[model samples]
Structures are given as C-alpha cells and as structure tokens.
Target: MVNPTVFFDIAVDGEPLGRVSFELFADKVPKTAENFRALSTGEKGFGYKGSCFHRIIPGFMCQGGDFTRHNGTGGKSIYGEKFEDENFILKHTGPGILSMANAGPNTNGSQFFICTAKTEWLDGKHVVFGKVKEGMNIVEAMERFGSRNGKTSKKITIADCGQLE
Candidate 1:
C-alpha cells in the first residue's frame, strides 16, 4: 500500500526551485493536516511570498515563512483543532521538514520553516505537520535567502500542492 502525502512545488519569485513533500502524520495530527489542505490552494505558504527566514541559529535551525499571525512569540492560532500531546508526533529532524507554526499551545498559523539541520529541541513543542521528503539542495539554497530584519529574500511561494503518487 502506498502512503498519502503532498509534494509542494516550492518556488521563488515564480521560479521552480524544488519540491518538498510533507509526509502528513495523519494519526499524529489530523487537524493540522486539514488546515494544510484548506490552504493548499496556496494563499501564501511563505506568507504571501513576502516573508523570510527571520531567525537562523547556526547549527540549530532556520526559522521563517510566517506572515503576521504566528511568529512563535505572540499571535493567533490557525490550526483547525488541537490534538492531545499523545496524538501528534511529527518530529522535526532536518531540511525539507516541518514544525507547528504556533505562538502558544496549538496556535499554529501560516508560519512554517524548512530546517537546515535536526531541531530536536522543538520536538513535541510544535506540530510537525509536513516535511520535505526530497530536495535537500533546494532547502540549502533557500537558507541563503531571507533577511535578518525579516525582509523576504526570494519571495517564496507555493505553486501547486495536492495528493500525488
């Protein structure tokens, strides 16, 4: 049997950079996946392609893709529903990976990040909705963009996303 997943065509300024598949942990966090489905039409994965990797702690992880609602500091949640700690278990390991875009609790919004390395510290703290099962070079290339002042580097945006084999 084949597993279900969504490989988003990651783009930059309307350029085909690469692809990232969020191996949705359905049993882990179903609601989060639902939210992702709703936004699959591409409202603005990288916060309308005007966002950036605001924070990068060398050897830790690169953080960005948040618009204005959830920046991990203070904001509203975008997750459709909150699952128990025991229900969600998509852990953050490395690039093309994902974690919950939350400000507090299950306050996941439009914010998300493609990791450059394993961010174990963020495990259980954020809901890792999806991950980039492929394309490491693109992930590496993405890190090169963005700004410290949060000025979107290449204007990241999702071209297309849906269930595909």
Candidate 2:
C-alpha cells in the first residue's frame, strides 16, 4: 500500500489536544506517510533538536517544518511529496489533519503543517498524510504563546510517536 490510514493523538503542554482522527493513505504515498509516522513516533526526527516553526499565518495555519530551522532556508529538496494520487478519498480537510506542505509538485521533504481552520486553499496542493486524533487543542493553544507572524511558540517538542492502539 502506497498510503495507509494512520491515526495520531496530538498532545501539547503536557496535556491532550483532543482525539482528532485521520486516515493516512500510506498505500498512496508510502514514503511520505512512512516519514511522517517515523518522525511522529520519534523514530527519526528532523535531526535538529529544538527546531522552530519559523513561519505562521493567523486564522489559517502555522507553517514551519524547517529541519534546518534557519528561517526555513535549508529544508530538504525532496520531502514526502511524491504521491501521484492526489485525487483520492482525503483532500486536506478537517481539524488537526497533519499535512506535508510544498512549494511545487513532488517537492515535499521534511516540513509538515497542521490545519487550525478549515483551509480549502490547501486542497490538492499538499499531502495529507495523517490526522491528529487527539491533542488538537494543544496545536491550537500554540497560537496563544508565540508571535502570530514569526509564530515562535514556547518551544514545543515531540516526546515520541508510536502505534495508536
């Protein structure tokens, strides 16, 4: 399967974000989902500890997956964005859905974003690898602690990721 349905529980500030759910189409985008699941479960992170989002947009989303974290100036050229089946069941909807952002087609590598609002502009333009089945509130709560532009939050870090049972 190129894409597989995976569920993740988003947590923040030592609390639950809420049980947000998503179907990770790994059967469609194996590499992308695999990378996301790996990083989400702490198997292989961006390799940079305490990185920054570095970018954010109010009422829409916060954009920052810079593995380099130097204002996103050194992100990998080839992230998890090689799925040729953009016309599938999922299309980047719902809250807390984890998606890989891209500037062009087939250019997703290590930067993913979470949907705070129902953003239709991202439809068919990004890879919706997974969803936050819980702890969305934690993602939402991030806005309250950082600059809305640079959107540097109070240093949120992933503790680990594992199979959702």
Candidate 3:
C-alpha cells in the first residue's frame, strides 16, 4: 500500500502561517505512522486540532500535539496513554524529519516534532516516522518565533489537520 499523507493548517497568534504536509513512513513504521494518521484525521475524537506547538527551538525543531494540555506536559496516544517506540530504522538526517516526542523510551504519545535543521543526535532516541513533504517554508516561518530554549511568546496553533487523498 502507498504511504499516507497528512497536513496541518498552522497559524501564529491566530494568523495563518500556511499549510504543511507530511509523508508518513507507514511501511517502515506502521504503528507509529498510524498513530499520527489517525490523530491527524481526528478519527479518534481527540487529536492535534486546536493544539499549540508548545515547544519551538529555532534551528532545532518545532514540537506540538498536546491536545489535552496544549503544552509539553500532557498528551495521549490514540492507542492509550502512551505507546512504544516503533523502531529506530529512520534517522533525523536533515530538516523536515517528523519524529515522535516522547518522555524518554517507549513513552510516545501524540506529541511530535519537525526538524528545522539536521538533528542526527536524536536518531535512535526518537521514532522518525514521517517527513515534511511540502511547505517547509511555512515551518521555517514558525521557527522565527522560537528561541534556543524552545520557548516562544507567540502561540503556534495547528488550526486544522487531516489526511490528504
């Protein structure tokens, strides 16, 4: 089967930032990718919609998907409160890599991050299950509001999200 594609309509402080699309590596990491797919479509009743990209570090990554708390401290997987690290087959080779944001090992929930620069250091620690297929510029735009500490005064919201045909 073909890999599923998904998208997020991002906004900064209520203004449209643009739409970002992703190509999920479903063949390599089915479970993890499925989690993102289901969550994006919001087929599970709760997902990334309205959630803010709570953590954003310029030249690093933009993290979000905390539908529960809209912050890094809270989020749950579509499967349960958490899920296992699917695999370390993919690498954070460069910008646009999409990977899970876990508490540590096997603590993955709905939270995930998109690399704005090469992040090889996170290769095996996080599950890299997708990549930005389009609108990297939009992500770069969001990066401007972040700092080295990943804190931002501006709220970056996932105004909408769903799977693409």
Candidate 4:
C-alpha cells in the first residue's frame, strides 16, 4: 500500500516559513502513522493547527504537536490521553526522520519531532513513523530558530496542516 502523505504550512514569528510534507510509514507503523495522519487532518475536531513547535534543538530536532497547550507539557492522542508505542521498526537514520516524542516508553501522545540530523542513539527509543518527502529547506529553516536549551526564540507555528491528496 502507498504511504499516506501530510503537509504542514509553517510560520515563524508571524512570517511564512514554507510547507513541509511527510510520507507516513503506515505499512510498518500503522497505528502511529494513523495518529499523525488524523491529527494532521484534524478529523477529531482538534489537531496540530495553530499549535507551536515549542521545543527546538539545533543540530537535533524540532518538537511540536501539542495542540491543546501549544507547549511541551500537554497534548492527547486520538486514542485517548496517550497510547502505546506501535513499534520501533524504523530507525532514526538521518535528518527529516519523524519520530514520536514521549515521556517514556509507550507514552506517545500528539507530540513528535523531526530530526535535523542523524540520531542513531534514538533508534530504539523513539517510534519512527514518517519522513520529510518535500520541503526539507523549510525544516532547516525551522532549525535556525532553535536554541541550545531546546526553546525557540521566535514562535514557530503550524499555520495549517492536513492530509495531502
């Protein structure tokens, strides 16, 4: 089956950054991919739209998906408050790999991160479910706002998001 695709129209400090599209590895991590896909589409009445990428670490990853709190502290999965890790079948091989962000094992919620570089140490810790298929430059642009403390100096918002045909 073909993997589902999604796109995020990002903005920084109220200025447009660009679009970043992802190809979900649904065939390998169906549950995880579906959660992201649904959130992207906001079919559940809430999602990534208007949410900010609250945590950013240059040379590492840009983290977001907290539609409720718009910060690192809160968000809920479509399944519930959180869900179990589907599997770690995919590796965090390089930049643009999408992986779940959790407090610990199997605590995945709406939070996710896009790698800015290879993160092999995260290979078995985080569930990798997607990767950037287009607009890596936008992802790189987002990285420019990151700080050493994992916070963004400017507001990096998901201006819009949804499934792509």
Off by over 4 Å in 2: 1-23, 41-50, 69-88, 161-165
lDDT of 3 by residue, 1-165 (tens): 677898778787888878888887888887867766776777866554676766778876666656674444246666667777767777656576877767768875566777778877866666777777888888888778777886786887766678776
| Error in Å for residue 6 of model 1 | 1.3
Per-residue C-alpha lDDT of model 2 across residues 43-99, encoded as one tens digit per residue:
554444334455656576776665554434345533432444343356655765666
Candidate number with the higher TM-score (2 or 4): 4
Model 4, span 39-149: residue lDDT tens:
678786655467676678887666665667444424766767767777776766656687776775777555677778787776666677777789888888777867879
Q: Please rank every candidate by TM-score, starting with the best.
A: 4, 3, 1, 2
lDDT of 1 by residue, 6-69 (tens): 6666567877788766666655665655556545444434223233345644344566554353
What's the TM-score of each model vs. the native? 0.64, 0.63, 0.85, 0.86
Candidate 1 overall lDDT versus native: 0.55
Provide the RMSD of all predictions against the true structure, rounded to 1 decimal: 5.3, 5.1, 3.0, 2.9
Instruction: Please identify model 4 stretches exceeding 4 Å from their true place.
Output: 69-74
The TM-score of predicted model 4 comes to 0.86
